[PDB]
Design an enzyme around this catalytic site. Structure first.
Site, PDB file in Angstrom:
ATOM      1  N   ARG A 142      -4.843   4.487  -2.979  1.00  0.00           N
ATOM      2  CA  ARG A 142      -4.673   4.822  -1.569  1.00  0.00           C
ATOM      3  C   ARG A 142      -3.520   4.054  -0.937  1.00  0.00           C
ATOM      4  O   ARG A 142      -2.917   4.532   0.032  1.00  0.00           O
ATOM      5  CB  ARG A 142      -5.970   4.568  -0.799  1.00  0.00           C
ATOM      6  CG  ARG A 142      -6.475   3.140  -0.863  1.00  0.00           C
ATOM      7  CD  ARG A 142      -7.941   3.064  -0.477  1.00  0.00           C
ATOM      8  NE  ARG A 142      -8.449   1.701  -0.544  1.00  0.00           N
ATOM      9  CZ  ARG A 142      -9.082   1.194  -1.593  1.00  0.00           C
ATOM     10  NH1 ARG A 142      -9.300   1.913  -2.681  1.00  0.00           N
ATOM     11  NH2 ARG A 142      -9.504  -0.066  -1.550  1.00  0.00           N
ATOM     12  N   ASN A 143      -3.199   2.872  -1.462  1.00  0.00           N
ATOM     13  CA  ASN A 143      -2.142   2.032  -0.917  1.00  0.00           C
ATOM     14  C   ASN A 143      -0.795   2.268  -1.592  1.00  0.00           C
ATOM     15  O   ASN A 143       0.081   1.398  -1.527  1.00  0.00           O
ATOM     16  CB  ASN A 143      -2.532   0.556  -1.028  1.00  0.00           C
ATOM     17  CG  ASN A 143      -3.658   0.180  -0.084  1.00  0.00           C
ATOM     18  OD1 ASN A 143      -4.172   1.021   0.653  1.00  0.00           O
ATOM     19  ND2 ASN A 143      -4.047  -1.089  -0.103  1.00  0.00           N
ATOM     20  N   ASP A 201      -4.263  -5.960  -2.304  1.00  0.00           N
ATOM     21  CA  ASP A 201      -4.943  -4.716  -1.945  1.00  0.00           C
ATOM     22  C   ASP A 201      -4.453  -3.547  -2.789  1.00  0.00           C
ATOM     23  O   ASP A 201      -4.234  -2.447  -2.273  1.00  0.00           O
ATOM     24  CB  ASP A 201      -4.764  -4.409  -0.459  1.00  0.00           C
ATOM     25  N   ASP A 227       1.167  -1.617   1.649  1.00  0.00           N
ATOM     26  CA  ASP A 227       0.064  -2.510   2.005  1.00  0.00           C
ATOM     27  C   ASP A 227      -0.522  -2.029   3.329  1.00  0.00           C
ATOM     28  O   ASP A 227       0.001  -2.363   4.397  1.00  0.00           O
ATOM     29  CB  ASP A 227       0.545  -3.953   2.097  1.00  0.00           C
ATOM     30  CG  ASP A 227      -0.384  -4.923   1.397  1.00  0.00           C
ATOM     31  OD1 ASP A 227      -1.536  -4.540   1.103  1.00  0.00           O
ATOM     32  OD2 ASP A 227       0.040  -6.070   1.138  1.00  0.00           O
TER      33      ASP A 227
HETATM   34  C1  LIG Z   1      -5.184  10.123   3.968  1.00  0.00           C
HETATM   35  N1  LIG Z   1      -4.063   9.690   4.785  1.00  0.00           N
HETATM   36  C2  LIG Z   1      -4.275  10.150   6.145  1.00  0.00           C
HETATM   37  C3  LIG Z   1      -3.977   8.233   4.747  1.00  0.00           C
HETATM   38  C4  LIG Z   1      -2.884   7.693   5.673  1.00  0.00           C
HETATM   39  C5  LIG Z   1      -3.241   6.866   6.722  1.00  0.00           C
HETATM   40  C6  LIG Z   1      -2.270   6.363   7.574  1.00  0.00           C
HETATM   41  C7  LIG Z   1      -0.938   6.686   7.371  1.00  0.00           C
HETATM   42  C8  LIG Z   1      -0.572   7.508   6.321  1.00  0.00           C
HETATM   43  C9  LIG Z   1       0.913   7.846   6.119  1.00  0.00           C
HETATM   44  C10 LIG Z   1       1.513   9.120   6.006  1.00  0.00           C
HETATM   45  C11 LIG Z   1       0.803  10.483   6.052  1.00  0.00           C
HETATM   46  C12 LIG Z   1       1.196  11.666   5.386  1.00  0.00           C
HETATM   47  N2  LIG Z   1       0.324  12.596   5.690  1.00  0.00           N
HETATM   48  N3  LIG Z   1      -0.609  12.109   6.504  1.00  0.00           N
HETATM   49  C13 LIG Z   1      -1.728  12.872   7.036  1.00  0.00           C
HETATM   50  C14 LIG Z   1      -0.370  10.845   6.756  1.00  0.00           C
HETATM   51  O1  LIG Z   1       2.798   8.967   5.843  1.00  0.00           O
HETATM   52  C15 LIG Z   1       3.154   7.667   5.837  1.00  0.00           C
HETATM   53  N4  LIG Z   1       4.372   7.081   5.698  1.00  0.00           N
HETATM   54  C16 LIG Z   1       4.497   5.761   5.719  1.00  0.00           C
HETATM   55  N5  LIG Z   1       3.440   4.959   5.883  1.00  0.00           N
HETATM   56  C17 LIG Z   1       2.217   5.472   6.024  1.00  0.00           C
HETATM   57  O2  LIG Z   1       1.092   4.644   6.194  1.00  0.00           O
HETATM   58  C18 LIG Z   1       1.381   3.262   6.089  1.00  0.00           C
HETATM   59  C19 LIG Z   1       1.390   2.475   7.233  1.00  0.00           C
HETATM   60  C20 LIG Z   1       1.658   1.111   7.141  1.00  0.00           C
HETATM   61  C21 LIG Z   1       1.919   0.528   5.909  1.00  0.00           C
HETATM   62  N6  LIG Z   1       2.189  -0.917   5.857  1.00  0.00           N
HETATM   63  C22 LIG Z   1       2.902  -1.617   4.783  1.00  0.00           C
HETATM   64  O3  LIG Z   1       3.336  -1.059   3.832  1.00  0.00           O
HETATM   65  C23 LIG Z   1       3.075  -3.139   4.914  1.00  0.00           C
HETATM   66  C24 LIG Z   1       3.562  -4.065   3.958  1.00  0.00           C
HETATM   67  N7  LIG Z   1       3.529  -5.264   4.527  1.00  0.00           N
HETATM   68  C25 LIG Z   1       3.944  -6.508   3.896  1.00  0.00           C
HETATM   69  N8  LIG Z   1       3.057  -5.153   5.770  1.00  0.00           N
HETATM   70  C26 LIG Z   1       2.866  -6.238   6.714  1.00  0.00           C
HETATM   71  C27 LIG Z   1       1.646  -6.890   6.752  1.00  0.00           C
HETATM   72  C28 LIG Z   1       1.449  -7.922   7.656  1.00  0.00           C
HETATM   73  C29 LIG Z   1       2.475  -8.287   8.512  1.00  0.00           C
HETATM   74  F1  LIG Z   1       2.278  -9.303   9.394  1.00  0.00           F
HETATM   75  C30 LIG Z   1       3.696  -7.632   8.476  1.00  0.00           C
HETATM   76  C31 LIG Z   1       3.893  -6.600   7.574  1.00  0.00           C
HETATM   77  C32 LIG Z   1       2.773  -3.912   6.049  1.00  0.00           C
HETATM   78  O4  LIG Z   1       2.336  -3.513   7.075  1.00  0.00           O
HETATM   79  C33 LIG Z   1       1.896   1.315   4.761  1.00  0.00           C
HETATM   80  C34 LIG Z   1       1.626   2.680   4.850  1.00  0.00           C
HETATM   81  C35 LIG Z   1       2.029   6.884   6.005  1.00  0.00           C
HETATM   82  C36 LIG Z   1      -1.545   8.012   5.465  1.00  0.00           C
END
Ligand SMILES: CN(C)Cc1cccc(-c2c(-c3cnn(C)c3)oc3ncnc(Oc4ccc(NC(=O)c5cn(C)n(-c6ccc(F)cc6)c5=O)cc4)c23)c1
Ligand SMILES: CN(C)Cc1cccc(-c2c(-c3cnn(C)c3)oc3ncnc(Oc4ccc(NC(=O)c5cn(C)n(-c6ccc(F)cc6)c5=O)cc4)c23)c1
Lengths: 263, 260
Positions: free
Chosen positions: B144-145, B140, B158
């Site tokens: 965005r990711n 993916d 991810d």
């Molecule tokens: C436009 N905007 C709103 C979009 C947006 C949307 C949502 C959150 C964020 C956001 C913000 C942030 C700041 N401002 N705003 C307004 C928001 O800050 C953040 N900090 C940290 N993370 C954030 O989102 C994440 C959440 C989960 C993951 N997930 C992973 O990385 C994985 C890797 N793996 C292997 N797995 C897995 C898969 C399967 C399994 F079984 C187990 C594990 C995973 O799950 C990555 C990112 C954000 C930004």
């Protein structure tokens, strides 16, 4: 009605230039009065055929659309009846919509980098087409850069094939005045000043009302003139009556554009 | 069996407001109580699975990573009816794609100079190299990711037919060369500062558009050599595409070759 009707035989329908849900647009050739064939676009329109409120308003909108005449409003060439489906015939424009054009300019192999002056002239054109439309009390209701066509002379003509273009008064109340079009004009202006950015980056569709009602507006682009942004900001004033008219906006932009040197 | 080593007791976590929401899962801010009694700001993605062992083994190996250009896994919670949730550190600067859009606005972050844009790419390659050397498939990859750490380095995370390689459109085949393809598109997103891939080209037109030999076009003020690198990611044959390790070093030369 039917002064806007062309015999089906006169129309050769080619390939689809884009398919929607309630309609499709295809390229075509129209055999004109003077023997020649014009390149046309043809929007097949699906109406609510359970009644005639759609059909009867369909012919009736085209009825007075035919009597329009403005270089910045796309020309209705006529309507066809195929059995039943109606379809609207406009002159084909090889340069397509302005939105797509703005994106293409960002590519080295696409049209040259659009100078600020041309961008202003783009908005002058749209305003001219809107001033004409509103001085006849015609409401567009889908103003956006995706709905602005580029004629072969590179002037812009308004057309009508979206929550981020809808005025805050129209989201909560179901209403649409000319001031609502003015609001979409502000977004269209911003859509152009950004060369095709989606409105409200980082704001989701379902959060638009809450974003707008708390008083937040579209944001000044990186190198947008201060005078130009205050013009587009006036399009988004909370109260419809406090917004300027298209006649007033058209002359503000004409004055701003002539303040700048050439190309 | 090392599920536990990854799991975090539910009572250590406090859930806050939504950062973003998807039908598969939603992400919330959170406070995680740590070993040393301090609390860390975290993101919490909740996952819904139809009636998990797999899930609980992804987090296992995913926790065993440590790259500064990969997002890190702090732990997993299971709340009750299973409601798995994934805990990662919170990054106030959000995703790269949104951040690119913000750069284009007066009020948002200042105009990103080409060198910084290059560093964004270098950072993503460093995280892909790590992950591909481990024989992981992202599957993916997109701007965005990619998250922006508080130090303004980029990490790979991810959470899309325009990011899918042509060999992966035909089949369901996917290899690290497919991620190389998405990395090329991600490079293009960054060069364009957030444009949608293939302007004027429709999601359904894509496989036919790609099969006729057309590629994402060169951005207006993007260096010829930068575009050569991202083009090589789009070669028809996956074997002719370079690796994340080769890409990583190509970008590093370009960055050093530029003045500061
Ligand atoms: C436009 N905007 C709103 C979009 C947006 C949307 C949502 C959150 C964020 C956001 C913000 C942030 C700041 N401002 N705003 C307004 C928001 O800050 C953040 N900090 C940290 N993370 C954030 O989102 C994440 C959440 C989960 C993951 N997930 C992973 O990385 C994985 C890797 N793996 C292997 N797995 C897995 C898969 C399967 C399994 F079984 C187990 C594990 C995973 O799950 C990555 C990112 C954000 C930004
Ligand atoms: C965005 N792109 C990528 C996809 C795309 C999709 C569809 C068409 C085109 C397209 C291209 C084109 C494609 N590729 N390229 C390089 C160029 O060229 C064109 N030239 C001319 N028109 C075109 O599409 C139009 C079709 C209909 C209208 N319609 C109006 O404006 C009306 C106003 N009114 C009051 N009515 C009405 C309403 C109700 C009634 F009852 C009566 C009348 C109307 O119907 C306007 C434009 C195109 C491009």
């Amino acid at each position: 009605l039917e002064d806007v009707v062309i015999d089906r035989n006169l129309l050769i329908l080619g390939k689809i230039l884009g398919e929607g849900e309630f309609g499709s647009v295809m390229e075509g050739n129209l055999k004109q009065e003077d023997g020649t064939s014009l390149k046309v676009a043809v929007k097949t329109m699906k109406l609510d055929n359970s009644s005639q409120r759609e059909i009867e308003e369909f012919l009736s909108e085209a009825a007075c659309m035919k009597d329009f005449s403005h270089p910045n409003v796309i020309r209705l060439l006529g309507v066809c009846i195929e059995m039943p489906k109606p379809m609207v015939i406009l002159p084909f424009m090889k340069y397509g919509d302005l939105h797509t054009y703005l994106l293409y300019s960002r590519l080295e192999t696409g049209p040259k980098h659009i100078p600020l002056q041309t961008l202003l002239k783009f908005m002058v054109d749209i305003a001219l087409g809107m001033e004409y439309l509103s001085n006849r009390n015609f409401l567009h209701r889908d103003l956006a850069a995706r709905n602005c066509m580029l004629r072969d002379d590179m002037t812009v003509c308004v057309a009508d094939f979206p929550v981020k273009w809808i005025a805050i008064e129209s989201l909560a109340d179901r209403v649409y005045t000319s001031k609502s079009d003015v609001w979409a004009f502000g977004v269209t202006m911003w859509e152009i000043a950004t060369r095709g950015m989606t409105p409200y980056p980082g704001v989701q569709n379902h959060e638009m009302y809450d974003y707008l009602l708390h008083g937040h507006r579209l944001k000044q682009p990186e190198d947008c003139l201060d005078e130009l942004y205050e013009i587009m900001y006036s399009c988004w004033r909370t109260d419809p009556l406090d917004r300027p008219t298209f006649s007033v906006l058209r002359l503000q932009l004409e004055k701003l554009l002539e303040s700048l040197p050439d190309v």
